[PDB]
mmCIF file of C-alpha atoms and ligand atoms in Angstrom:
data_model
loop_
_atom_site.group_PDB
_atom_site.id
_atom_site.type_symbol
_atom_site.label_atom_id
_atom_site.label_comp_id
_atom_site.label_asym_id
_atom_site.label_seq_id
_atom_site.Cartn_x
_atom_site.Cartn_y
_atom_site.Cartn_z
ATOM 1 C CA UNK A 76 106.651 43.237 -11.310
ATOM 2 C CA UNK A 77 107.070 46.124 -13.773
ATOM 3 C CA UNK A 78 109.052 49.107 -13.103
ATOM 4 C CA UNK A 79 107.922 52.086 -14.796
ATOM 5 C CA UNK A 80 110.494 54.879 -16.864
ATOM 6 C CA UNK A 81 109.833 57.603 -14.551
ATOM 7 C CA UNK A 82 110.091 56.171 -11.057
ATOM 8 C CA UNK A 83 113.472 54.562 -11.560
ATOM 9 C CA UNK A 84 116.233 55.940 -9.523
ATOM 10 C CA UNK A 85 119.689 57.429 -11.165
ATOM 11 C CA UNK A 86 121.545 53.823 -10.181
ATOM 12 C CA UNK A 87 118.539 52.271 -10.987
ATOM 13 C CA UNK A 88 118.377 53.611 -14.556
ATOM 14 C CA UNK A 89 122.126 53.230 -15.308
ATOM 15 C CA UNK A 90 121.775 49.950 -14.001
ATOM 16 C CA UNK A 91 119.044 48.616 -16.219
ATOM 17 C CA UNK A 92 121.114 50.627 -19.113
ATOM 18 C CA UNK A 93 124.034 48.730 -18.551
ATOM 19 C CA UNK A 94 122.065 45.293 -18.859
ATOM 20 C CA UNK A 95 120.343 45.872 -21.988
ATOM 21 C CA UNK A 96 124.289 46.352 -23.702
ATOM 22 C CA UNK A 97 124.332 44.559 -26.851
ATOM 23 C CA UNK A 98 127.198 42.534 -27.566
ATOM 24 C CA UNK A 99 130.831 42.610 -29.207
ATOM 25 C CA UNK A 100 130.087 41.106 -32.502
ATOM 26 C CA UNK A 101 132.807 39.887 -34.880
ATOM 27 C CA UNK A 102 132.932 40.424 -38.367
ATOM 28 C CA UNK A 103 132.078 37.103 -40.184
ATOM 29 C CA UNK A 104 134.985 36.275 -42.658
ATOM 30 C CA UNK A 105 135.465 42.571 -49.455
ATOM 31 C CA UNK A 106 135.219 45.623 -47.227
ATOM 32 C CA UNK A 107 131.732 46.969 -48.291
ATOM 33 C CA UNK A 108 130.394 43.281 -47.679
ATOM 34 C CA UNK A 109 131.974 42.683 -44.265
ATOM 35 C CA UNK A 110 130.875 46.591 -43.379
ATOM 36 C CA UNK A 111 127.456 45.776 -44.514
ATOM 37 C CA UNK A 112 127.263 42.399 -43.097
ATOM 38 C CA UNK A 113 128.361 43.454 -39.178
ATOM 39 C CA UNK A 114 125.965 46.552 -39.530
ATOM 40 C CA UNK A 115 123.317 44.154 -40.186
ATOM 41 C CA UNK A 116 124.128 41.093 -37.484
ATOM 42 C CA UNK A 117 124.074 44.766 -35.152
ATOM 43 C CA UNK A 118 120.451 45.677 -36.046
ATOM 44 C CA UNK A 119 118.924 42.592 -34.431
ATOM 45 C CA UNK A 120 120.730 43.357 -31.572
ATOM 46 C CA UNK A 121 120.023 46.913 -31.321
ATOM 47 C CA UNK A 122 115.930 45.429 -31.706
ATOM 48 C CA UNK A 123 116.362 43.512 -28.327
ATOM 49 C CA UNK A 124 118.506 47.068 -26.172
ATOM 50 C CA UNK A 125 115.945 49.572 -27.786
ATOM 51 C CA UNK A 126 112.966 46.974 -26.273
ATOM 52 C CA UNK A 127 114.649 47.665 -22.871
ATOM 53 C CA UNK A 128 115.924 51.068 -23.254
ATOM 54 C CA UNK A 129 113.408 52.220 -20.247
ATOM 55 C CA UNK A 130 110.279 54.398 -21.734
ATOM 56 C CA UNK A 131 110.279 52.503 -25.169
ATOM 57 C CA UNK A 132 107.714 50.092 -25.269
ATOM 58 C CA UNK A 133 105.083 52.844 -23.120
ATOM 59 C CA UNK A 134 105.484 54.093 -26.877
ATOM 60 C CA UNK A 135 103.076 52.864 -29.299
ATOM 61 C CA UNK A 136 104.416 50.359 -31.797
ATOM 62 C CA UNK A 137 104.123 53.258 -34.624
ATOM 63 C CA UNK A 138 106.340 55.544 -32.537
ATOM 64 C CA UNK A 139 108.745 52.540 -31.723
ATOM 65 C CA UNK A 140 109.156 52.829 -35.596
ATOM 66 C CA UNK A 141 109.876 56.373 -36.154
ATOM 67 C CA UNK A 142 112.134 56.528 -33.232
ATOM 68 C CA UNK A 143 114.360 53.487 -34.787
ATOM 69 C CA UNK A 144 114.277 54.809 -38.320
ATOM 70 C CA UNK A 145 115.439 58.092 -37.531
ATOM 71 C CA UNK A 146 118.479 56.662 -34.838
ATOM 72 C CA UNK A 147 119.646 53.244 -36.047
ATOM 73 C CA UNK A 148 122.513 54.676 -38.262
ATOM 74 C CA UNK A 149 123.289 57.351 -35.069
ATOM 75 C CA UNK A 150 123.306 54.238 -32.832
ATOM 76 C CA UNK A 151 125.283 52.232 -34.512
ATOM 77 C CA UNK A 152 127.902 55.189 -35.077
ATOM 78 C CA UNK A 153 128.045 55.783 -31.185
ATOM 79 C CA UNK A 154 128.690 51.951 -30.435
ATOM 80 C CA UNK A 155 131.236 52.273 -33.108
ATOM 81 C CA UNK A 156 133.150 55.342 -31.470
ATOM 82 C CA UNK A 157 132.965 54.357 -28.161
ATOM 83 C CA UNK A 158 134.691 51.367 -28.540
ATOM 84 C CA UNK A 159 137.407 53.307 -31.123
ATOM 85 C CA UNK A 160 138.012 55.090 -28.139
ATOM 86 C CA UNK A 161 141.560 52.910 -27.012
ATOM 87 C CA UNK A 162 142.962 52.861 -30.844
ATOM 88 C CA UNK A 163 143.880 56.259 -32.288
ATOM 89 C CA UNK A 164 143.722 56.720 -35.957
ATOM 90 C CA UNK A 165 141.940 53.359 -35.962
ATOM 91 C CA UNK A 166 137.927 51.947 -36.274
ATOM 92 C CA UNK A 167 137.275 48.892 -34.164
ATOM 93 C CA UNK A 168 134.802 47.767 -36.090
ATOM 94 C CA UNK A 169 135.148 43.967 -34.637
ATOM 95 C CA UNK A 170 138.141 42.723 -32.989
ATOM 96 C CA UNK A 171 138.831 41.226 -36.170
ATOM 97 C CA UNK A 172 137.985 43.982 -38.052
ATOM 98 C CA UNK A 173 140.261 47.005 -36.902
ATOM 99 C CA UNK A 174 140.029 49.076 -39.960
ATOM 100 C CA UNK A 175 142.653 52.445 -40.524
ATOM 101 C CA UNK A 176 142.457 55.571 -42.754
ATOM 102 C CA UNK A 177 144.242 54.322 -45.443
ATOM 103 C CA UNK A 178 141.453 51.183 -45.406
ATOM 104 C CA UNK A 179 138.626 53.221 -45.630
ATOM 105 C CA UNK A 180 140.381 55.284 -48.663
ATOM 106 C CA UNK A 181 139.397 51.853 -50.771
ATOM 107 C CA UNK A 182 136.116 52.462 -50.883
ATOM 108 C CA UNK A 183 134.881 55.901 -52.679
ATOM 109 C CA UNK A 184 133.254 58.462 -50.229
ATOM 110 C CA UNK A 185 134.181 56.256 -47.557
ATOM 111 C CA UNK A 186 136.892 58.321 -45.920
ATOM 112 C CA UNK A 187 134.852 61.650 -45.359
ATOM 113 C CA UNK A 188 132.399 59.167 -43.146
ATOM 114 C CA UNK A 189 135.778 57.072 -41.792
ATOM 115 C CA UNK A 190 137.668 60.654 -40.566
ATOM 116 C CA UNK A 191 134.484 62.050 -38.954
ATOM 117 C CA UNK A 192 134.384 58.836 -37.192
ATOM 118 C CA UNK A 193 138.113 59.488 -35.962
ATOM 119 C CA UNK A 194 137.482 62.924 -35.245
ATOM 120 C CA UNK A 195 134.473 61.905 -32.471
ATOM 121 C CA UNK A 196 136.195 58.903 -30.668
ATOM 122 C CA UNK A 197 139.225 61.202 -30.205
ATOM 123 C CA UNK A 198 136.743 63.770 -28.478
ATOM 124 C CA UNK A 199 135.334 61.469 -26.480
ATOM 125 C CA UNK A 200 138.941 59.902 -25.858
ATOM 126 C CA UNK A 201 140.099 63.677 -24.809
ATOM 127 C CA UNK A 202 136.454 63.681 -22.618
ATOM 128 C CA UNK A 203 137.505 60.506 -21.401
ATOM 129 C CA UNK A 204 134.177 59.291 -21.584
ATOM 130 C CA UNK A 205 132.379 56.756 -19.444
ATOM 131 C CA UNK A 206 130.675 53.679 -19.515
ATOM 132 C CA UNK A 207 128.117 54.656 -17.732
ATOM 133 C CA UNK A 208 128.137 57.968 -19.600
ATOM 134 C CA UNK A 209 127.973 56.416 -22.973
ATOM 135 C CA UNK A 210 124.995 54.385 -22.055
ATOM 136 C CA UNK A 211 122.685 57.549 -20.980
ATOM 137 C CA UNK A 212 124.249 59.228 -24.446
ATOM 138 C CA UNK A 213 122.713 56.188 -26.581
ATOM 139 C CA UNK A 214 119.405 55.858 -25.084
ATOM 140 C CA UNK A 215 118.907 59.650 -25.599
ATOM 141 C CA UNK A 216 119.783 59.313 -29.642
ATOM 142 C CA UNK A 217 117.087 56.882 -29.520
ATOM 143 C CA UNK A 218 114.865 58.890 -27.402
ATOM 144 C CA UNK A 219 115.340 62.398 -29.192
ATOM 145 C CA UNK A 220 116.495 61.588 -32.932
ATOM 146 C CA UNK A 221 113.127 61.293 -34.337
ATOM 147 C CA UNK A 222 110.969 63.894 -32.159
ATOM 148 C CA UNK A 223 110.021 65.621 -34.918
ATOM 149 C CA UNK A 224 100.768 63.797 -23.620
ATOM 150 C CA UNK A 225 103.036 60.623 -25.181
ATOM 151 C CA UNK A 226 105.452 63.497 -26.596
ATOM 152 C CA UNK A 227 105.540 64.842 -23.123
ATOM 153 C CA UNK A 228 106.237 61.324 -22.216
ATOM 154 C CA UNK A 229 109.129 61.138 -23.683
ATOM 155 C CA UNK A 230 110.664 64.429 -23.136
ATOM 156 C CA UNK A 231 110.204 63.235 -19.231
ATOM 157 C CA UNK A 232 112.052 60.318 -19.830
ATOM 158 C CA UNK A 233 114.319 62.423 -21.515
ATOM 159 C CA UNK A 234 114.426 64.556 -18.448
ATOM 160 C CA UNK A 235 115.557 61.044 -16.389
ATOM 161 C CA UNK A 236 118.224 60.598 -18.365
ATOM 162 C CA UNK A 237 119.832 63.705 -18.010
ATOM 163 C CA UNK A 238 119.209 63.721 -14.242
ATOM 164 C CA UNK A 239 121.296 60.431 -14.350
ATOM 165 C CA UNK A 240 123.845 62.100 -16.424
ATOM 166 C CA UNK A 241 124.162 64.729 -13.842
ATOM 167 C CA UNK A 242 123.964 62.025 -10.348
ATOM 168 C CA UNK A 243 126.994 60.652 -12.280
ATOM 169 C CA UNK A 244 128.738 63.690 -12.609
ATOM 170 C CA UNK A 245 128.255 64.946 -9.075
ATOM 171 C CA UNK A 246 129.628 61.117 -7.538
ATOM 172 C CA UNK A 247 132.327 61.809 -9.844
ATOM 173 C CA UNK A 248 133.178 65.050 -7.633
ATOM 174 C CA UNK A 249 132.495 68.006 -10.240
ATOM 175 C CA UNK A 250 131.372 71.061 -9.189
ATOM 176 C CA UNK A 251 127.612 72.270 -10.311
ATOM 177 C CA UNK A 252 129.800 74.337 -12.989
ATOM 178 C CA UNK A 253 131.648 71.706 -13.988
ATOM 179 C CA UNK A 254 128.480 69.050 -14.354
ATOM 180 C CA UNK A 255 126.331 71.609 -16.825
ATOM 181 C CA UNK A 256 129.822 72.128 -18.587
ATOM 182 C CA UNK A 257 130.358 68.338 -19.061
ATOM 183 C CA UNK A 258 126.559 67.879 -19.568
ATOM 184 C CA UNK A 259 126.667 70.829 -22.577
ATOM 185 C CA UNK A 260 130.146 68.914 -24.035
ATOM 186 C CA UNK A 261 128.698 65.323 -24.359
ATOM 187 C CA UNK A 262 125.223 66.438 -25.551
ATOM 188 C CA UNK A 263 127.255 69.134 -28.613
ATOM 189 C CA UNK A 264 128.855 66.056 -29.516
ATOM 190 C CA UNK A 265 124.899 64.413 -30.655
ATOM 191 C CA UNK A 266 124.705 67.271 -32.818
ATOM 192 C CA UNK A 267 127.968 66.035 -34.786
ATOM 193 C CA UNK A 268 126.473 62.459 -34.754
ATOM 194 C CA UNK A 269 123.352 63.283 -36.429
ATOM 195 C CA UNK A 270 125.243 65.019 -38.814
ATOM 196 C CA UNK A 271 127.375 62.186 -39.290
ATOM 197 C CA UNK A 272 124.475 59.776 -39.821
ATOM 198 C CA UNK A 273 122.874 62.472 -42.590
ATOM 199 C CA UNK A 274 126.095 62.024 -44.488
ATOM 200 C CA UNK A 275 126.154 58.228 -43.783
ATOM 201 C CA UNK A 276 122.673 57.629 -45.046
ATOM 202 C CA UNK A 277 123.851 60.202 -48.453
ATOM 203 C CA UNK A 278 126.738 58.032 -48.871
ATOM 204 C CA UNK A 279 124.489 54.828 -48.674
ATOM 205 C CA UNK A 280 122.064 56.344 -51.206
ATOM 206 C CA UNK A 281 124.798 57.276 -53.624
ATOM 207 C CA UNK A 282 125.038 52.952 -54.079
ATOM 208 C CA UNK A 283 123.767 50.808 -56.818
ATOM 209 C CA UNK A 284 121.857 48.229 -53.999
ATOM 210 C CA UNK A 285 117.813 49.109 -53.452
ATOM 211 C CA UNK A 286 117.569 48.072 -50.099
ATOM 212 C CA UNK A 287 120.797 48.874 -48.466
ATOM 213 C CA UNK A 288 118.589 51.410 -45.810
ATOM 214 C CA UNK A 289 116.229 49.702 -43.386
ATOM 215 C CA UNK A 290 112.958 51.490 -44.247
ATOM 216 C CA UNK A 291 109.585 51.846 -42.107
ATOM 217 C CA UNK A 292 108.419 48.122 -42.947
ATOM 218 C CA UNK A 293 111.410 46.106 -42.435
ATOM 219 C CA UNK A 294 111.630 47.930 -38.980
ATOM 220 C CA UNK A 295 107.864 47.338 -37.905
ATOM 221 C CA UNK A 296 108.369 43.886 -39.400
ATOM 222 C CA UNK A 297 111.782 43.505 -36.710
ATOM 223 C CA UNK A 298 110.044 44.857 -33.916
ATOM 224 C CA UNK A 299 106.685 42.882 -34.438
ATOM 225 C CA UNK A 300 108.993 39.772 -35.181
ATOM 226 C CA UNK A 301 110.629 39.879 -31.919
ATOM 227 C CA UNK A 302 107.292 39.399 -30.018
ATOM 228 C CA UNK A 303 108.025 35.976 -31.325
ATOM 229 C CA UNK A 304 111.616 35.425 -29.748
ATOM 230 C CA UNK A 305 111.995 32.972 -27.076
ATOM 231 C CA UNK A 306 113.169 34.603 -23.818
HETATM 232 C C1 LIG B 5 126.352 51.013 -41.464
HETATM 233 C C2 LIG B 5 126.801 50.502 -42.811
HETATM 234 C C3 LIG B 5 125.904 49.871 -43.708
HETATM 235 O O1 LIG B 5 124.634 49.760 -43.279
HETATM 236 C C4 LIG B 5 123.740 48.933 -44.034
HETATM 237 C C5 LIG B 5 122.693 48.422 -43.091
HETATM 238 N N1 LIG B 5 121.535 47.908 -43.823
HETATM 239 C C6 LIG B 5 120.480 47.395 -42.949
HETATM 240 C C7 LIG B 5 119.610 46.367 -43.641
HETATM 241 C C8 LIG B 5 118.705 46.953 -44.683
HETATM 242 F F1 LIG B 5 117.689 47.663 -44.069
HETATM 243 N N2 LIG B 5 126.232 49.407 -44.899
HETATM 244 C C9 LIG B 5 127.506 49.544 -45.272
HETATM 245 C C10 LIG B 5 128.441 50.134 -44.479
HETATM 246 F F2 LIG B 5 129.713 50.249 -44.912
HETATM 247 C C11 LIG B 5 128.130 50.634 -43.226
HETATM 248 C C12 LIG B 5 129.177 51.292 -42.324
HETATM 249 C C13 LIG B 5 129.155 50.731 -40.935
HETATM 250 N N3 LIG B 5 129.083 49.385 -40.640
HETATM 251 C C14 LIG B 5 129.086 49.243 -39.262
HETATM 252 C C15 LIG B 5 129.027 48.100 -38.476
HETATM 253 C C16 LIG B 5 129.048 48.247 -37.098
HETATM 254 C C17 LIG B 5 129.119 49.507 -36.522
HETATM 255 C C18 LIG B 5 129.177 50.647 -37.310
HETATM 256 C C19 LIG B 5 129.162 50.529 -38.697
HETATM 257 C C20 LIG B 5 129.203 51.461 -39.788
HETATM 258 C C21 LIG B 5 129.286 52.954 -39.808
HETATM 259 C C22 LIG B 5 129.740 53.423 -41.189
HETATM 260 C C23 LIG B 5 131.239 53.286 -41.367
HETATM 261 N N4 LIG B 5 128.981 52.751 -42.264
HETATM 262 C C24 LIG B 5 129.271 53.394 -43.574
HETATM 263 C C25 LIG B 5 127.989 53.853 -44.271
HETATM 264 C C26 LIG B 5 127.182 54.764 -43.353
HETATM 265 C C27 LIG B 5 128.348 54.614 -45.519
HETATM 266 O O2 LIG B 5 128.839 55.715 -45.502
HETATM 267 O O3 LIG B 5 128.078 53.963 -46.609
#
């Protein structure tokens, strides 16, 4: 059978989050390339979660589009962070591609992008952020990046997700205080990854390549290709 978005339950949800999870990818080997490279290898991948992020493909293919073109660089970023988390100072990037500062400082303009980086796994470090947290954080930067009946389709599965934020706040023992406190803390933190993506995507313009951002095409082309995948 097929479960629809808005009759999941809270486990149910986080469950089905937690088994669309792309995977640990390592960097295949200078810096550009291999920072280039991985971001690319993590696009297919992020094709395959966003298919299964629950609510997505109600949307019509057009919509699917916009929603990917306007998150894939905030998406990519959160992955990145979260799993920064454990390494102060430091990018885990790969696990053979742990990348400091001082690395980043090769690269011009890369630093401003690397520090911001630092600056939001250390929050979420301080947060002490959750798996199952991080999960509900991603799907919603998919969900609400490029917003602007099917729009009040999404804002319900919006709504879900931030019921499940909450049901995961309350088993955690806060207080109804403490869970709108928490809830108004992680979702502040979206506002500094879109930002963070704007200069990103600035940064990638400011580059001699032509077709170093996936545009509208290449991302239809992706998500129509994958019709074709073998399960
Ligand atoms: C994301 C990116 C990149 O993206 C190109 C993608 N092209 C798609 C095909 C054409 F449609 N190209 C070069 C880069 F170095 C980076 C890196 C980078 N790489 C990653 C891999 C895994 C996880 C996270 C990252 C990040 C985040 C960040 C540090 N990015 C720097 C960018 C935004 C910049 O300021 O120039």
């Amino acid at each position: 059978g097929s479960h629809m978005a808005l009759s999941l339950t809270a486990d149910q949800m986080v469950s089905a989050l937690l088994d669309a999870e792309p995977p640990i990818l390592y960097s295949e080997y200078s810096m550009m390339g291999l920072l280039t490279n991985l971001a690319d290898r993590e696009l297919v991948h992020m094709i395959n979660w966003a298919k299964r992020v629950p609510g997505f493909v109600d949307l019509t293919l057009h919509d699917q589009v916009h929603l990917l073109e306007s998150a894939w660089l905030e998406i990519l970023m959160i992955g990145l962070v979260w799993r920064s988390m454990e390494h102060p100072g430091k990018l885990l990037f790969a696990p053979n591609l742990l990348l400091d500062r001082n690395q980043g400082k090769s690269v011009e303009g890369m630093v401003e992008i690397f520090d911001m980086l630092l600056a939001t796994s250390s929050r979420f470090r301080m947060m002490n952020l959750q798996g199952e947290e991080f999960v509900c954080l991603k799907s919603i930067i998919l969900l609400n990046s490029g917003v602007y009946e099917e729009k009040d389709h999404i804002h319900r599965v919006l709504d879900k997700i931030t019921d499940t934020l909450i049901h995961l706040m309350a088993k955690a023992g806060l207080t109804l205080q403490q869970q709108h406190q928490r809830l108004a803390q992680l979702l502040l933190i979206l506002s500094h990854i879109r930002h963070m993506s704007n200069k990103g995507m600035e940064h990638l313009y400011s580059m001699k390549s032509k077709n170093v951002v996936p545009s509208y095409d290449l991302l239809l082309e992706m998500l129509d290709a994958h019709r074709l995948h073998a399960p």
